Amino acid sequence: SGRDYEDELQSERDYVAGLYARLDAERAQSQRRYAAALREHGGTAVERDAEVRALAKDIARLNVADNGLCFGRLDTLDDARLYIGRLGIFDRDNDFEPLLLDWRAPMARPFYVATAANPENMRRRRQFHTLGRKVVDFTDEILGRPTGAEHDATNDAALLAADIVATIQAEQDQVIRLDHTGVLVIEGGPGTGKTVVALHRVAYLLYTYRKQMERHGVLVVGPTPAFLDHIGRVLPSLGESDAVFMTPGDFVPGLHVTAEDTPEAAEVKGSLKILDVLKAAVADRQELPSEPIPIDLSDVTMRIDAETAKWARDEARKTGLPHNEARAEFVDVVTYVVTERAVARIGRGWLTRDDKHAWEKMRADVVGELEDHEQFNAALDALWPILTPEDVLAQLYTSHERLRAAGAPECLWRADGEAWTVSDVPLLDELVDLLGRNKAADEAAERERREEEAYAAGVLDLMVDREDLMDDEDHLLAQDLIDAEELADRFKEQDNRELSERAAADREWTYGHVVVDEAQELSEMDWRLLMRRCPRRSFTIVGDLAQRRSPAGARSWGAMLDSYVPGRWVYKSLSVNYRTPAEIMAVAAAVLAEFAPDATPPDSVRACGVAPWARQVTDDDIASAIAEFVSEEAGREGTSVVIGPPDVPGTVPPSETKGLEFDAVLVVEPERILADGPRGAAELYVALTRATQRLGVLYRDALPQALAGL
Amino acid sequence: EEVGKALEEFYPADNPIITIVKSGATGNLTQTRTLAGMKGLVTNPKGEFIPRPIKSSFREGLTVLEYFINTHGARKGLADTALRTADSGYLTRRLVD
Amino acid sequence: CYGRSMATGKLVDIGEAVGIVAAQSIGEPGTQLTMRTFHQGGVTGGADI
Amino acid sequence: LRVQGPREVQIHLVKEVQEVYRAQGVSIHDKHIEVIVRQMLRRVTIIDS
Ligand SMILES: [Mg+2]
Numbered sequence: 044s045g046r047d048y049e050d051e052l053q054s055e056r057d058y059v060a061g062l063y064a065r066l067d068a069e070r071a072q073s074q075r076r077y078a079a080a081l082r083e084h085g086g087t088a089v090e091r092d093a094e095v096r097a098l099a100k101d102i103a104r105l106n107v108a109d110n111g112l113c114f115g116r117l118d119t120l121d122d123a124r125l126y127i128g129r130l131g132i133f134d135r136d137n138d139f140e141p142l143l144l145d146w147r148a149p150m151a152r153p154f155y156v157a158t159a160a161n162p163e164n165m166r167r168r169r170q171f172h173t174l175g176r177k178v179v180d181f182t183d184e185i186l187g188r189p190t191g192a193e194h195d196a197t198n199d200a201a202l203l204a205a206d207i208v209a210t211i212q213a214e215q216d217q218v219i220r221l222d223h224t225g226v227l228v229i230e231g232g233p234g235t236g237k238t239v240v241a242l243h244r245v246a247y248l249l250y251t252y253r254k255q256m257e258r259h260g261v262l263v264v265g266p267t268p269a270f271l272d273h274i275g276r277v278l279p280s281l282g283e284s285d286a287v288f289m290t291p292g293d294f295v296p297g298l299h300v301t302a303e304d305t306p307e308a309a310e311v312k313g314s315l316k317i318l319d320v321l322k323a324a325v326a327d328r329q330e331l332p333s334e335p336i337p338i339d340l341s342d343v344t345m346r347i348d349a350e351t352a353k354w355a356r357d358e359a360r361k362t363g364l365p366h367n368e369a370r371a372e373f374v375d376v377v378t379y380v381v382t383e384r385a386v387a388r389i390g391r392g393w394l395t396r397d398d399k400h401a402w403e404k405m406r407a408d409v410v411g412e413l414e415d416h417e418q419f420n421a422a423l424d425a426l427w428p429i430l431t432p433e434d435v436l437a438q439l440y441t442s443h444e445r446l447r448a449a450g451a452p453e454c455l456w457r458a459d460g461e462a463w464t465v466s467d468v469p470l471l472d473e474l475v476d477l478l479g480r481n482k483a484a485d486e487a488a489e490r491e492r493r494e495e496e497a498y499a500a501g502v503l504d505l506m507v508d509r510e511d512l513m514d515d516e517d518h519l520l521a522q523d524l525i526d527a528e529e530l531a532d533r534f535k536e537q538d539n540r541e542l543s544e545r546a547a548a549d550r551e552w553t554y555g556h557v558v559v560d561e562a563q564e565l566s567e568m569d570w571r572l573l574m575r576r577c578p579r580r581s582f583t584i585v586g587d588l589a590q591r592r593s594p595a596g597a598r599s600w601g602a603m604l605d606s607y608v609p610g611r612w613v614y615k616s617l618s619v620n621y622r623t624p625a626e627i628m629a630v631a632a633a634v635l636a637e638f639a640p641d642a643t644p645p646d647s648v649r650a651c652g653v654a655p656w657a658r659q660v661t662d663d664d665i666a667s668a669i670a671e672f673v674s675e676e677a678g679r680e681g682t683s684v685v686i687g688p689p690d691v692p693g694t695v696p697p698s699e700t701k702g703l704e705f706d707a708v709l710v711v712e713p714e715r716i717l718a719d720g721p722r723g724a725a726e727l728y729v730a731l732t733r734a735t736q737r738l739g740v741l742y743r744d745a746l747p748q749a750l751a752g753l
Numbered sequence: 754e755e756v757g758k759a760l761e762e763f764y765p766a767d768n769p770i771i772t773i774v775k776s777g778a779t780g781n782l783t784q785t786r787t788l789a790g791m792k793g794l795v796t797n798p799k800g801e802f803i804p805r806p807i808k809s810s811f812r813e814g815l816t817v818l819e820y821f822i823n824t825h826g827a828r829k830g831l832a833d834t835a836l837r838t839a840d841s842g843y844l845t846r847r848l849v850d
Numbered sequence: 851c852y853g854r855s856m857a858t859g860k861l862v863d864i865g866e867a868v869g870i871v872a873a874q875s876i877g878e879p880g881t882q883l884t885m886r887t888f889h890q891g892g893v894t895g896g897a898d899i
Numbered sequence: 900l901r902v903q904g905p906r907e908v909q910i911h912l913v914k915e916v917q918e919v920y921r922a923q924g925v926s927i928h929d930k931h932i933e934v935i936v937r938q939m940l941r942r943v944t945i946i947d948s
Pocket residue numbers: 514515
């Protein structure tokens with residue numbers, strides 16, 4: 044951290060303070076004018092309303108912009124300066140020279156679209172990270188060949204400073220600028236910087252299509268909100284109120300699952316092959332009784348039998364509507380048969396086939412009675428009940444007889460039926476479409492609306508009529524312009540929740556764009572759910588297949604996407620490894636060959652010479668080894684991490700460090716990491732590939748065959 | 754605002770037009786400015802301000818386009834005044850009840 | 851407790867319908883207040899003050 | 900109401916309504932708004948007897 048960096052940061056902080064002072068002055072002026080206009084306008088009502096609303100809009104815009112006023116700065120090749128922020132601030136005393144540019148302004152376009160391969164007449168792009176009225180720090184990126192003296196938290200300038208670099212720039216530009224407006228799959232090996240390219244790509248896409256997606260909203264899915272962090276730090280108008288974040292266990296609104304299922308039940312539950320099971324499950328609830336159920340009617344001893352129940356459920360199946368929707372057909376057919384039989388029984392001697400107005404009249408009486416008969420309703424609840432996804436899944440998992448009948452494997456039985464894992468979430472959501480809504484009637488709300496409309500109509504009737512007007516001349520009356528319904532609606536609460544709240548609470552919301560980080564981990568059912576939630580098929584899919592740890596995760600992008608966008612999805616792969624030292628990739632390739640004889644290791648520039656080191660730990664010194672590792676890396680710059688099984692207190696589990704990078708990385712006892720589940724080797728690979736400066740390993744007895752190199 | 758201040762400064766204290774306003778009898782300095790100063794800004798049919806002001810005054814006489822754009826809010830007010838009474842009566846009836 | 855009557859300037863008399871007077875006094879100047887937009891469409895005008 | 904009690908909530912309601920009416924240039928004596936508010940807090944809800 045250079046001292047000159049601190050001086051530059053202080054200068055930028057002072058500039059932002061001046062901008063905020065001008066903002067405060069403008070807000071004070073606006074408040075004063077707004078109060079004066081509200082109090083003593085002295086003009087016409089329409090003009091008063093116009094000025095008041097304009098001033099209120101200005102005040103609200105300033106209040107919104109108060110948080111994180113300035114996004115960053117642009118250095119033009121002419122050595123000029125352009126500040127990008129949430130508001131346009133101009134020097135009225137200097138020909139309105141821009142002191143701050145609104146991010147939507149045309150000259151602020153480069154800040155989002157410029158790249159090192161196609162610099163839009165800019166040499167440096169500077170981002171400010173702000174927690175309020177204060178700039179915490181700034182990070183710069185050179186739009187060209189770097190030199191290493193620049194300070195950026197991502198270290199991209201230093202890593203690229205350590206032509207192949209030209210090809211890296213060209214590839215990153217090709218990914219970023221792609222005008223596909225479709226499903227884009229970005230893949231890259233570790234140390235290539237797929238995260239940075241994905242962030243720039245999503246920023247470009249959101250900026251260029253902001254008008255088309257300002258109302259639909261953007262959904263973000265991944266193990267961490269980092270992508271939403273970047274979106275908020277570059278597009279607050281969209282990140283704060285329009286963006287939405289969800290983990291695969293949080294797709295269902297309200298529910299929030301974190302437990303994960305076993306690596307075999309998850310696989311079956313994560314594949315469309317289980318869809319046929321779900322249908323069967325809801326078909327398994329089309330029960331018919333093993334013994335006749337007495338109706339226990341008041342006068343007649345009617346009863347229902349497996350014969351008529353079979354016929355009724357057969358007809359309801361033939362209708363093809365969802366469960367709670369075909370309930371109507373089932374109940375109607377059952378009622379038809381039971382009423383025919385009951386009327387025949389009551390119609391003895393005096394009535395045989397008097398179809399017109401006598402037989403039919405008794406049918407009417409019998410149906411009118413039966414529809415309110417408690418025992419009949421209880422029977423129709425026992426047969427073909429109304430179901431929710433939980434009612435289906437819990438019973439299906441617990442019974443162990445329903446699983447056998449439905450063809451579901453016994454790999455997924457559990458007594459705690461209502462204990463949900465992340466794998467059950469997509470099934471629970473799909474059961475929403477399979478079961479359907481009961482299509483109930485909202486009588487109470489309708490009555491409330493009717494009463495409000497009646498009161499509004501009474502209010503209108505309370506006004507003077509045209510015939511009785513005493514004014515000098517005829518004029519428009521309120522009754523000529525507004526009706527009772529409009530007036531009644533005018534005074535309702537009309538909730539106006541934000542999109543970030545409105546969409547997240549709606550299971551059926553269709554988003555304008557979907558971003559998926561670490562997308563290889565999603566199961567096929569998760570892809571089905573997301574595609575159901577994004578009919579536009581506008582996706583930014585980021586991940587790496589070789590780093591998968593879930594069993595249901597993707598093994599080939601084609602197998603996941605061809606079902607929805609055959610051939611239309613565009614694949615971009617990044618080739619060059621530069622962020623990690625080549626020595627790290629030396630062992631990463633060895634660990635990676637276990638899954639493919641050749642695989643596709645990226646070629647590695649920037650060899651550092653500081654070789655990774657491996658240490659034997661014996662006689663209760665592993666805990667020490669990590670203790671001195673952390674004590675040493677505390678004073679050696681940057682950030683450092685230790686990765687190992689949770690059985691060691693001082694290590695983060697390998698799954699958590701999926702998308703992060705660090706200067707010093709220690710991995711403890713890889714022999715246990717290898718044995719962790721079906722993907723232990725992959726975990727090791729991930730854990731190894733997080734190091735940018737220094738890599739250490741602790742092993743107990745001997746290095747595993749792959750790790751014998753270091 | 755500057756034109757209104759200049760108009761207020763220029764007028765003699767005993768001028769009948771300003772005498773009526775300053776005595777609390779009728780009108781405002783806004784109406785006096787619109788008459789002998791400048792009409793100012795006018796609103797679109799959708800309520801937004803038109804950035805081009807009516808630099809002319811009714812003393813000088815408005816041009817054709819200035820008059821046409823001025824007619825918008827003039828007609829809008831006719832319906833606005835009628836509509837406001839509905840809400841006023843709604844609240845009044847609730848309070849009376 | 852109600853106190854001086856505004857119309858007469860004297861202590862309010864027993865039997866005066868102060869409720870209707872208050873309702874009328876609060877409702878009559880309602881036309882001077884700002885109101886929700888009369889335009890049928892558009893965004894919610896309550897986002898701004 | 901739950902924190903400060905009926906007295907303070909009535910005072911708060913009167914204060915807010917008069918703030919709205921004063922910002923718009925309308926002068927109404929507080930007693931009319933108090934007459935309106937007094938009817939807003941005439942009830943007690945029971946849980947046990
Ligand atoms: Mg008249």
